[PDB]
Design a protein around this ligand. Structure first.
Ligand SMILES: Nc1ncnc2c1ncn2[C@@H]1O[C@H](CSCC[C@H](N)C(=O)O)[C@@H](O)[C@H]1O
Ligand code: NA
Ligand SMILES: [Pt+2]
Ligand SMILES: [Pt+2]
Lengths: 265, 265
């Protein structure tokens, strides 16, 4: 009868909510996708064991082109679950999926889970101060995306922080590191020369949020661009004018240079 | 003392994550606070029953002024859990708390949970398009705050959505409804004449996020300002120019007027 959008959380299979687990356990069919993000702390096997169901993993093409062709033949007889990393509707196009299903006569429910979008709070940066978000995409051939640079510019001018989701090619097992995003940004700066992202820009890196020991680091690009932040996933943040308490957190928790406390300079 | 910040999630006692529940059960002492927000879909008794541990509630004062005298000296040699609605560290007081503990030589870990910041994704509005967020506070005495109005203007001006939290008196359990928020915003519009919030402005109201049956409504102020959105807490969002996909989602899921497909896209 119905379709469940169930988020699995940030890091591992335990990041799912109790609500999500109890509902997943009782679904007749369980589908999942693992291309919108990376859950570096678990495996398909562990998730299957926790839920006690066999999980059919879908590729991006299966979902975007054949979702209703794969699910309709079931959702019309049985309860179906669709599992995704983090929160199913955050920084994905899965919301549009609910539209398809509804037009096809299948009602759906969403079960939220920890998302990187709110997890940024662990960096000490005021979540309300974040502005428009962007994604740093891998260049492809001659195509070199650069719009994320303009987003940073617009937010920074307003004194707002910029959350930069990093690119991922799940089928090639390529997960963009914060180091790589910084290299790409330095190159876009070299081209545009807007003084938006340079060696002296203060950035914040959050790696593997959701794990008990995520990597939280802050400092100037020149010092962090070659630093090892551990395995992916990574998220990069370009803060705006800092609040003193934001600077305190970055210094005391993220090991930032004590000089940022002079938010005046 | 190792301190575990554990988020309780959006609505009820099942919104905590499997990870949070298990860690909370392993902790010798479990504290909680419900002053930053309330868990409107459940009760302390129900959360206590699920966690299977005695839950010691702490007031805003207990936390901000005496946390080191209550939690620490109690949990000399043990692990302590501190339960908070939503996702820990989203609220500023939690981040400050972590800094304080670190200075006191106390290490802490964070177990994330769904936050309203990511949950709003259920409105169909793309998360990347949200800009600076703000809170609508009641005017009182000789004080009439209006900054939240400027936040809307700056965001919408750039085609960004504005997430608006509504005033809450946790201790007294009093909430500002979306209706009241709308009246206040119109009152501010009359004072500023910015053409930012009027009877023709498109807004979205979200209530009981986390619940399996949340209330998601979209429409013009003139139509929504007297609608019954149910029990608080409510969340008000003033979107910017809509993506056609966003608009279709609002029409088909949040019952928005077909009219938005040509007026707000
Ligand atoms: N646990 C994590 N730690 C650090 N970054 C993460 C992360 N999870 C996701 N990200 C970031 O977000 C990108 C995927 S976008 C999908 C986000 C997911 N829907 C959610 O709600 O969390 C990743 O490439 C990475 O840039
Ligand atoms: Na935001
Ligand atoms: Pt989208
Ligand atoms: Pt919250």
């Amino acid at each position: 009868m119905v379709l469940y959008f169930i988020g699995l959380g940030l890091y591992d299979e335990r990041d799912i909510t109790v609500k999500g687990l109890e509902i997943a356990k009782k679904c007749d069919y369980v589908f999942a996708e693992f291309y919108t993000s990376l859950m570096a702390g678990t495996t398909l096997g562990r998730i299957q064991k926790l839920i006690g169901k066999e999980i059919r993993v879908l590729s991006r093409e299966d979902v975007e082109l054949n979702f209703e062709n794969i699910v309709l033949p079931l959702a019309k007889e049985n309860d179906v679950a669709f599992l995704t990393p983090g929160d199913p509707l955050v920084a994905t196009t899965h919301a549009e999926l609910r539209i398809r299903m509804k037009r096809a006569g299948v009602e759906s429910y969403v079960i939220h889970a920890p998302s990187i979008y709110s997890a940024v709070g662990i960096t000490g940066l005021h979540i309300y101060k974040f502005g428009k978000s962007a994604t740093v995409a891998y260049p492809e051939g001659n195509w070199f995306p650069t719009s994320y640079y303009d987003v940073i510019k617009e937010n920074a001018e307003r004194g707002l922080h910029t959350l930069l989701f990093l690119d991922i090619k799940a089928e090639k097992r390529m997960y963009m590191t914060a180091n790589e995003a910084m290299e790409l940004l330095l190159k876009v700066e070299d081209m545009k020369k807007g003084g938006v992202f340079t060696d002296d820009t203060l950035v914040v890196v959050l790696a593997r949020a959701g794990s008990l020991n995520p990597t939280i680091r802050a400092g100037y690009v020149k010092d962090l661009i070659r630093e090892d932040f551990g395995d992916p996933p990574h998220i990069l943040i370009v803060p705006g004018k800092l609040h003193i308490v934001e600077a305190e957190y970055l210094v005391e928790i993220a090991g930032a240079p004590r000089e940022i406390l002079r938010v005046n300079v």
